[PDB]
Structure formats: C-alpha cells, structure tokens
Design a protein around this nucleic acid. Structure first.
Ligand SMILES: [Mg+2]
Ligand SMILES: [Mg+2]
Ligand SMILES: [Mg+2]
Ligand SMILES: [Mg+2]
Ligand SMILES: [Mg+2]
Ligand SMILES: [Mg+2]
Ligand SMILES: [Mg+2]
Ligand SMILES: [Mg+2]
Ligand SMILES: [Mg+2]
Lengths: 240, 58
RNA sequence: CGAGCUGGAGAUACGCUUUGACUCGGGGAUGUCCGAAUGGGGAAACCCACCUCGUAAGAGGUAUCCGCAAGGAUGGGAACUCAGGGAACUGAAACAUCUCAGUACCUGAAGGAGAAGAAAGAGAAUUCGAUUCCGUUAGUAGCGGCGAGCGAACCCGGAU
RNA sequence: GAAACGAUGACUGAAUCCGCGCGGACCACCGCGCAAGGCUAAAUACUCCCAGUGACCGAUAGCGCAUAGUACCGUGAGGG
RNA sequence: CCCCCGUGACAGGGGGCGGAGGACCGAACCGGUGCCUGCUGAAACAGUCUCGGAUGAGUUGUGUUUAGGAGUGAAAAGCU
RNA sequence: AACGAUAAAAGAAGUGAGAAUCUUCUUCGCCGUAAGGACAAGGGUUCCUGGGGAAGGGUCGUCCGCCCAGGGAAAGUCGGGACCUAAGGUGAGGCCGAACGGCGCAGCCGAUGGACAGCAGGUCAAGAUUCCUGCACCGAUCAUGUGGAGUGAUGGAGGGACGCAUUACGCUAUCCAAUGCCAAGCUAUGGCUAUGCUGGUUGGUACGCUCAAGGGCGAUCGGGUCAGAAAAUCUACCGGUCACAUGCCUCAGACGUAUCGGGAGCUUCCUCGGAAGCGAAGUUGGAAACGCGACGGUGCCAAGAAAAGCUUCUAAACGUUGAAACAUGAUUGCCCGUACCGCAAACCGACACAGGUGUCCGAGUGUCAAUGCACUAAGGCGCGCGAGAGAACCCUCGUUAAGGAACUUUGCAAUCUCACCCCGUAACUUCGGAAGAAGGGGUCCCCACGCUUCGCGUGGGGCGCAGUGAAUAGGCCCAGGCGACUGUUUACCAAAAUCACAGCACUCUGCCAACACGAACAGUGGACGUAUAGGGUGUGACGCCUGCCCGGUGCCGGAAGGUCAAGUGGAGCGGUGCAAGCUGCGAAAUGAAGCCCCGGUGAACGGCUAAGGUAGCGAAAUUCCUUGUCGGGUAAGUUCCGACCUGCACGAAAGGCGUAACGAUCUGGGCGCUGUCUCAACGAGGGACUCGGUGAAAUU
C-alpha cells in the first residue's frame, strides 16, 4: 500500500446518468501505472514486490529503477519478486522487458502493446492477455490481438515481453449476488420486465419476446456498429 | 361519510314541541330555624352552619 | 412668509420663535451597511486583507471592459420602439396546407420616443419626386386544400 | 404557381457609357433610376408621474387596497 | 494450523484448536405480514396484539448532484 | 356527539370576589434504556422577577408555554471564523454556443472530515471550561541574560493517511459486599438492643532511586548517474558497518507525601423559609466499557479521502560585531454563538395533534447472558373536564360444564407450545443440512459431602395443587404448486409465482471503442478502463438436458445482372429581334447508398403452406365438455394426492423435466389445544345512561 492518487466513484456526466447501472463501490484508490515506459528506457530495475490492486484484474509489479524512483508496472504472467526489468531497445527480450516491435522476434507473445508511440500501453493489459507478433512488414508489424484480429502497428512502439495473467477469471465465480455489489450496482434490468413507456421490450400482458432491440431503437444481435474511418485501412479481419 | 343525517330542517315549532320538557324545577327551599335564611332540606344552612347545633364553621 | 411652531397620533414634560421660527420655493453640505456593487470571500445588509495619507481616532484606493489621455461601459425603468428566437389551443363543424401568428412568450439593444429616411423608387402621366402618420382608394387587384379564410398599392385628400 | 424583385446559408462570380438595374417568366422596342459609405429634425407611439374634466363608481361599487400587496396560504415561483 | 487411523481410483474419518457466514434466536434500529380497532379519526393511512430483517445488496446524519416528455426506478407507469 | 391514549387518586391547610381544577404539606399510583439526563437541528425570548386576568388553554382557573413591564445571556484555550481540504460549487487567462448562455486547468468557496493552548470548584431569581476563587497552558510583541552562530522558502522529501471481522494483556469511569472507617440518633408493635437500622466512605494539581502492563524504535559511512524540474549537509535505490537477546525511549494507571476543592451532616438567625459559618472517615475484598493503554495481535478481501499544521532540506536572500534557540520578567489576546424548549404542549405535523426527529449518558436487585423481562434509585410524571350509575348494545380483557373444527370460503380468531439443563431425534440430501426435528425427563427449599468458583454434582430431608412457581417466553407433523437461495416492490386496498440474483447463452465494441448526455468538429460519462473489458438482450443455484422447420421478417455475407438522386452531358423542340445575341423547355448515356436477387443464421421474430413435436411432463397455476375414469384418505370429498390418457388450446434457454435447503407464498391432510361452533353464561374494565361545565358535523 503506497504512493497512489485517490479515485472517486461517479457513473454519469454533467447532467444525468449516461452509462446505466454501476453505483456500488468500496472506496478503492488509483495507482499511477507506467505504460508508455520510455523516459526510463536505459535503466535496469528489480521486482520489489507484486501487490494486488483493483480497477484492473492484473497483478501489479512495484519496480525500482537505479534512479531511485519507483514506478508501478503491470505484472506479466511469470515474474517472481526480485527479478530484473530493463527498458530501452537494448534489452534481452525476456519477461518484463520492454522493447519495441521492430526488435521483437516473430512468434513472440507480448502484451502492454501501444498503438501510437507513447501515450502509454493500450492493447493487451487486462487479466491474462496475449498479443503475439505475426511478421514485420515495412514500418508496421502484423500482430494478433486477443480478439483474434490483425492490425498493422508501426514497430516504432515499445511492448512488454510476455502475457499478463493475474490468474484467471475462470474459477472466480463471484459466488452469489452482492459480490457484484462489492463492485457495480445491481446489474442489468430486464427491459422485458418494464413498461411500453420505459423501454421497447415493455408491456405485453404476461411474458413477451418480439423485435429484439436495445433500450433505444437499434438492435443488439449481429448489427454492426463500427463506422467508416482511418484505422479502417490500418486493420485486417474484423469479423471473428 | 356522515352516514345517517337528517332529511329536513326541523320547524322552529317542531324544535320546540321537543324542548317542552327542559324546564328546571326550582329548589324547594326551607327556612333555617336559627338565622332564618332559606336552606336546603337535609343539608346544612350555608349561612349559620347549623343542623340543630352549629356543625360547619361560621 | 409674517405667529406661530414643537410630524401622522390624537400625550406629558422640555422648549424653540422679528438679531422672524414654522412652512413653501431654490441651490449646498452630511449621507452607516447592502444592492450593477466593483478590495477578496459571501448562503444581501455580513466576515477577512492590503497599500497610501495620518494625532491616533479617522481619510482614501484597491472590479472587469474600450481607449496615450480625458473620458465612456456594466444596473434599473409601467407601457411604447427595433432586433435575434418564436408556440399551441383554436378555425377549417375531423385533419396533415393553410388558419390562430409571426400574436403569446424568451432574449438583446435604445430613447423619450423610436423606427424610417433623401431613389439602382413608385407609376403608365414620356407623372410624382426622402421617411413616417390619419383619410380614401377597397375589402377593389390578387392570394387560397382557389376550402376555411387572408388581403395590397398607385392616384386623391390631410398632419408635417 | 408561367412567378418577378427583394433577402441570404452554400457553391460560384460581371461590367463601367457607343456603362449598369429595374419596369413580374422571356425578347426587342419604349420608359423610370444610377446600387455595393454615412448622419438627419418634424408630424407617429405609449403612458410610472402631474393637472383638468366626466348623462364614471361611491364601499359585495370603484384599483387588490377609503390602503395592504399587509394578514393570511405556499419549500418556492406564486396567491392574496 | 497441530496431532492419531486408513487404504482395492476412489475418498476421507477423528481429536484439538481456530473463528468463517448476503449463518441462526433476538432488542435498539430498519420493515409492515394477519386480525381487531379507528374512517365527521388521537392520526389526510395510525394503534394494540402478531410478524419479517437483525454485519448486510445493512440502517442513519451533514453537505451535494439529477426534473417535466424530463429525472429516478432491484421496475408498480412506482416516486419526483 | 365529543372534551384527544383506562399511568388512578385522597385528605388537610392556604390564597381569593369566586376554585375539583392555583400554592403548601402528607400519602397514593405511573415511567425508570425511560414518560430521567446532555446536545443537534429547528424555534425564539418561549428563560427569571413582579404584575395581569379579555381572548388562547377542548372544562374551572385566583394559574400557564398566554397579556404587560423590567431583568437575564460575559470565554486567548468550548464550536465556528481570521487555517486545511472532499463531493460539489466557482473559475483570470482557454474550449463551445441564435440570444440568454453551455463547459473549463490553476486558483478559490465549500464539513459532515483534518488541525489546534485549561482543569478543579463556587455561585445571581435567571449565565458559566465564558464571571469569582486556586493553580495551568498557547501565541504574539518588548526588555534582560545565556548564546555564541546563520536564518532557512508560494520548491523537494518525510509525515499527516485512515478498511472489515475477531482477539491477548494491564487499567480506569463506574458498580457491588463487609462485625472495615466516620456521623446522626432511635429504638417500643412479639423480638433486637447492636456484631441492629440510615447515611457518607475523594476530585485537581506538584514532587516522589515507588510500583507498573502495554506500547515505539535503526544510526551511520559511503556509491552511482540515469530519480525527486533545479539545488541539497534532505529523500529513494545500491552496498559496508552493529542492528540475537537486548537495549533503550514512553509510561495507561496505581501507590506515598503535600496541597487546593469537595465532603454526610452540625450550628445560628429568620421577615418562613432561605441566608450565613463550620466539617468527620475516606479500608479490605470483588466486578467492570462500546473508553484509556496503543497507529497492540491474528485473520480476511470486496483491497479501504485530500489538504494544511508539522519534521527535515535547499533556492533566493539580508546577515556571519549585534543570528536561530532557551529561560526570566512584562504587555497582549479580535469577530460570531453561548438564556429557554430540544423524542417535544416550545422543532415538522392547520390544533398545548396517541405520529415523525440525528447523537451521547442511561443506576440497583433478581433472571446463563443482555440496552430483554419484572420491581425500583436519582429524577420525572398522574397525560387541562368532573361526578354518579352499573341496563340494552360496542370495544379491550379473565374464567367456563360436556363435546372438541361439528364453525367456516379458510381452525379467520383465540388457545395449546413457550426459557435453560440432560437424554433422544425420520424421510430426503449438493452430506452443510433437514433439527429446537419428532418424543421424554429435570427446574423450589434445607443439610452434608466433594467439585474450578459465582455457581455445580452426589446423597438424605422438607413444603404446596403447582417449584423458568409471578413478567419476558417455538404449537408440531405428512404431502403437493410456484420460485432455487438472502434480498426487492405497488409512500395512502396487491410483498407475491413480481423484480433482482449467482450461473448460462447470443451479439456488438479496437479504443478519441461500441454506447449514452449535450445548442457544441465544447465538454463528459463509459474508463484514468482496453476484449478473460465494456455495451446490449434474453435466461436464471445445481442436475440430466434443450429436438424438428430458415418459406416469410430481421441480421450477416455474397453480389452478375434489373431498377434508382443530385450532378455530368448536349442533341431535339419553342420564344424575341433585323441582326449578332439573349432567353424558355428538354433526351441518350453516364451517376451513391439502397430495393429486387443468391446463400446463410433459431439461447433471432417465429412456426411445429418451410417443416411438421426428439426427450420430458400431461384434465397440470396451462382442459372446454368436467365434480373425466380408476385408486387413495373420509361415515360421506366438485377440493387434494397417484395413475391413465381423449394434451378443446403442454414442451424444451417467451427454456423442458427434477431437485436438498430457504418462504409473513399458495393448496390438501393429520396430532395437540381451544368459546370457531353446539348455545352460551358469569365476571372485569372503557363507552353508552344521569347531573354540573364547554359544545361541533354531514344534511336541510
Ligand atoms: Mg353602507
Ligand atoms: Mg393603497
Ligand atoms: Mg420475534
Ligand atoms: Mg423467523
Ligand atoms: Mg365518568
Ligand atoms: Mg405435484
Ligand atoms: Mg421467492
Ligand atoms: Mg425474503
Ligand atoms: Mg352535559
């Protein structure tokens, strides 16, 4: 427990509620976690400890740089306490090392990957995830994202060797209700158990099931949502 | 509501046929044997306090 | 201005008035705190500062916007004026055009008035000749699910 | 609507006297006027305030108020 | 966590000790299930008896935020 | 009719024009985790004193929370402000916007939280950590001495910084006992005679090689450039050195001495009852916090504010003759709140309303325990109409012959049960549970004996009808529907089979994500997250499962060709003029998405012509005919259980079938008990009736 900014609940913006549900809590805090990890490249550090922190589902490594400063950094599946972390293109592609893709061996399974030089990590970071490399092209690398997708990425971007783990939300069965309350307000409210007024799947004497749409009028099963833009060219194989 | 309720205002008359029975009976005062003021039979004379002798204080 | 005055108050006491009170006119001087409010905070009238002038008491400045600078602006006005935005009931015996209306309401700006104004005009006489207002033309020309219904201008008279 | 002209958000984009606009699509002819700078009394409107008047009222009338937006009601706007 | 017994795939069972739980009984507290009462009420929704919950998705104070076709809603078209 | 809870009241005495209703005394009764006490908020003067006697006070009133007048409230340290920051509010300069205006970093405002200097008493009619008395502490400013030198920021670091449950040890507040101590007297009814009875039985401060559990702890040297923007004699990291034990540092509290106060009562005057002066003892034993020691120990996951004060550290800086710091004096101390009510006739409820209100204190005895239950201290109060009567009927209670659910829509209601020991306890089961299952026994008093003590066991004895002897205080069981479960809901007729839920499934979403709020290429929420994530929809523990039909609609993908907008493209047609020219109309082809079209997809709409019901269940909460038919239980069953099947109109995630456990759920049965009932009776209290006081309503 140490050196972290305070987090405050809030499930809606300026005026009213925006992202339904979510209201419970516990008071959790925020721990600034190094993602971009460049200003520190060129300095070795050791796993002082792996603390378990919320707002993440992902162990947290408390690294210490020769500089003297500490910096929490996601903990990949494997690092024990006391090992070594080193940033900068000059780094043995091992667990915890952060080295851009250009310098990353094909078939190498890494996470914490960015999408644009800096602004921190972005892909592969949530509890146990693995984005492996496919095979450099020109300036961009082909990689496989946890959703089974293929995106070019200019190898200019660092990455962390290895895959996160923090065990696995597989046996975590949240027991009975109220565990969800240890986190977010009573989940989903069956709009089919509301009123013609309140939502599309309202009324009906008895029990319904027609039209299939979201709280508003769109459709939820198999209706595309992404639009026509840039990244679009920079992408390969959305479906599946 | 106020369930039973009257069907019509009652005559000033009717209303009086009624009260033909509310007339007080004046006491039947007796005259105290001593101070001679009037008294209430079987009670003590409030003016002298007697009832043969003087029971109540002056 | 000349016997009275001492507010409404209807009371007592003290008093003040020709070196003319009082009252009426007309200028000054005082004018705590809040309020655009503007030293800073503030759930109005409270709470806290600072710099300068200084006997200390006490005085004064300390807001933002235009401008060297004087100096101007922020606020408030019953209705009237123009502007930006602009309903519906209702009618059409229903209703979507259309009507009710660009009315009601909101907002901005302004003054005692505004707005408008000195013609790339109106008109059919090779006429009038800034703008505005009243009369008339006329409910005519025309607009209109050519339905409900809406409705000019020129000329001519008059304010100026 | 055959529907001109005025206006403007969006694209465009002219001339200048043997020049320019319009006169209800459009053309010629005929005709009236010169746009893209400006300021301007006066007659016009209203009425918080003031005076005068009234085939206006005269106290359940007349303003809500012979005075009070008070008492009273409302968290409040507000009503009164 | 510490001791004793057991074995054919089977386990576990036992004693200490620990102190878990949208665990149990139950008062404050939160609720309001059934009956009577009360309906010109003590009360514009209550009382008595009875009952539900009782470390939990718990109960509550202060400050603060969301509103009208709008907010809020463990969802009755409920509350505002 | 009512006079606002059935916590009662009696007498005496006093005042007065007049008193059930005011005051005094003496009794009675009610509350006592409160109907006592202290605040908060809210209200304001309601507080105190003297008057008053219209109206208000459900009745009187000589009285009052009402009317009149006067008085009362006192803080360097208690709360707040001149200090801090959270949500949130605001916001120069910035981002947006038809207007008004909408957002927004720093900064600022903003407690309900942080920080911070006092205690013990006395006492006005009415105030008190505010006034007095005693002793104390904090800051500030000056003087004096000491000192002998730096002082050290709107900056760095350290720190303030923080959860839930459970738990060891020491202690206190506080409470209990005694042939302890002090004080006062008296005692009689039969006795006691004091080893009886009543009452009191220490708070602050200062010192003490005194006792004392518990609690806290690295310092130092150096290294490195890459860290704290920078700087550092600070902080972090690296390593060296001693960091067993320990050791220190600190002491909750106790004890002793001193001293200051208080202390049951005593005495005196008295204008009637206060005033004044004085004063004893302070023991041993026992219990004990939700507090103190302390930011203690262990365990747990859902993983538990910020900011200033503070500590150290430099920058800059004036200064190293006169510094910072300590001490001893002195002077100094601002604004606001502090009365009274405050779980209630003083606040919210139109009423002095049976309601609503946050926090704290909350004694004793008995009872495993307790903030339960009974009685009761302190203290507070008998509820602002009263008296009689003793009928009908109504409400709230007590008992009830014989019977025992015959009542009735339903055992609705009301009984029975009812605590704590011991013994004993089924099906079924996810092996937890079903269980407090079911059933049976004990329970008081004395004495001896032994025990771990309060307490308890063993034996003997005793008394009653009866011994959790009075109050608190489960009725039990079989079977079925529904829902798994705890939970949630129609404030004021529905609590449930509703909703939610853990679990499952489909699908969308590549991150300025899908999605949503918004005037807005602003801002923001999703998320300071990133696909084992977030959104949406449906299903709803667990278990075995979950079929057939993509014709139609939708969704995805395919995609030749057909069709389709503006626009591009200018022929063809017409106008005017003399003419050049200027002007109307208007194709071919070409031209986006989409629509037609091809295939696909059911835990998509949906159906069982595109197919026709795999399993499982079945007259079921989904069956019409219907009280179907047989069986069950009953003397007798339209209901209920089990089968069958002819499923009017079951059926597999609008989920099918089952399932331990759970239910103020719904249904049927049984045991026990009972006034539910055959039939009601008697009794009680509170109305109803009567008299005195006050005195409505709907209706007409
Ligand atoms: Mg008259
Ligand atoms: Mg007036
Ligand atoms: Mg109970
Ligand atoms: Mg229960
Ligand atoms: Mg009586
Ligand atoms: Mg069944
Ligand atoms: Mg249920
Ligand atoms: Mg429940
Ligand atoms: Mg009477």
């Amino acid at each position: 427990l140490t050196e972290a900014l305070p987090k405050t609940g809030g499930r809606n913006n300026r005026g009213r509620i925006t992202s339904r549900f979510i209201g419970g809590g516990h008071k959790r805090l925020y721990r600034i976690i190094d993602f971009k990890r460049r200003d520190k490249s060129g300095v070795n550090a050791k796993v002082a400890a792996i603390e378990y922190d919320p707002n993440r589902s992902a162990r947290i490594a408390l690294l210490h740089y020769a500089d003297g400063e500490k910096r929490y950094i996601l903990a990949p599946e494997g690092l024990t306490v006391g090992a070594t972390v080193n940033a900068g293109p000059e780094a043995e592609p091992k667990l915890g090392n952060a080295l851009p893709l250009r310098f990353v061996p094909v078939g190498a399974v890494v996470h914490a990957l960015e999408l644009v030089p800096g602004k921190g990590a972005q892909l592969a970071r949530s509890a146990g995830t693995s984005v492996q490399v496919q095979g450099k092209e020109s300036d961009y690398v082909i990689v496989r994202l946890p959703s089974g997708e293929l995106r070019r990425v200019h190898s200019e971007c660092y990455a962390t060797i290895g895959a996160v783990g923090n065990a696995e939300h597989k046996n975590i069965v949240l027991g009975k209700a109220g565990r969800s309350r240890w986190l977010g307000r009573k989940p989903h409210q069956r709009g089919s158990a509301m009123n013609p007024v309140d939502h599309p799947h309202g009324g009906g004497e008895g029990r319904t099931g027609a039209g299939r749409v979201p709280v508003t009028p769109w459709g939820k099963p198999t209706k595309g949502l992404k639009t026509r833009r840039k990244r679009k060219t920079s992408d390969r194989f959305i479906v599946t | 509501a106020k369930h039973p309720v009257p069907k019509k205002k009652t005559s000033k008359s009717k209303r009086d046929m009624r009260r033909s029975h509310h007339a007080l009976t004046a006491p039947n005062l007796t005259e105290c044997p001593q101070c001679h003021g009037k008294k209430l039979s079987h009670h003590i004379c409030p003016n002298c306090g007697y009832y043969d002798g003087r029971q109540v204080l002056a």
